[PDB]
Design a protein around this ligand. Structure first.
Ligand SMILES: Nc1ncnc2c1ncn2[C@@H]1O[C@H](CN(CC[C@H](N)C(=O)O)CC2CN(Cc3cccs3)C2)[C@@H](O)[C@H]1O
Ligand SMILES: [Zn+2]
Length: 148
């Protein structure tokens, strides 16, 4: 189906497809509640598209209030701040053998970060994507890069 058609009514279907639980990779993670077909649009990384130059001061503010800072870097100029207006996608952990990938899509003039299933994902599995950004990696994959 064309990309703009696939983006419509994710809020309703993502509440039934995924859930947030403790993760053995790190803290909390996103897990699937039912089998997700390969190529399927899982969830949007919801939040506010902000200027990248403002992330340093925004993260400093959040850290000073004891509020966890959830951000997804679009490019050198833009970042999605999911701290206040986010959804369950903000808990997606990194893996060197991910079952998901991130993409910046443009729907009716507006930018959205969406998560796609790279293979069929089975009930109970944690959803992961490759983070592009040393920090030690705990994905546990055979072909682990050992750092994020
Ligand atoms: N494969 C990995 N191996 C090791 N560490 C990982 C991996 N993959 C995600 N990580 C960590 O997770 C952060 C990305 N986070 C994803 C969700 C996280 N699991 C959460 O519970 O909130 C979001 C940031 C915001 N921080 C809030 C905090 C809660 C507790 C301590 S800090 C976590 C990353 O920057 C890392 O520090
Ligand atoms: Zn890894």
């Amino acid at each position: 189906l064309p990309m703009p058609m696939r983006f419509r009514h994710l809020k309703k279907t993502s509440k039934e497809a995924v859930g947030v639980y403790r993760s053995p990779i790190h803290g909390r993670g996103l897990f699937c509640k039912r089998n997700i077909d390969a190529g399927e649009m899982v969830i949007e990384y919801a939040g506010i598209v902000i200027r990248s130059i403002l992330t340093d001061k925004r993260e400093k503010y959040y850290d000073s209030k004891g509020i966890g800072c959830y951000m997804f870097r679009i490019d050198d100029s833009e970042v999605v701040d999911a701290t206040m207006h986010g959804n369950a996608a903000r808990f997606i952990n990194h893996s060197c053998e991910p079952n998901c990938y991130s993409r910046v899509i443009n729907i009716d003039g507006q930018k959205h970060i969406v998560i796609f299933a790279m293979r069929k994902i089975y009930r109970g599995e944690e959803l992961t994507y490759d983070y592009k950004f040393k920090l030690p990696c705990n994905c546990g994959a055979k072909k682990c890069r050992k750092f994020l």
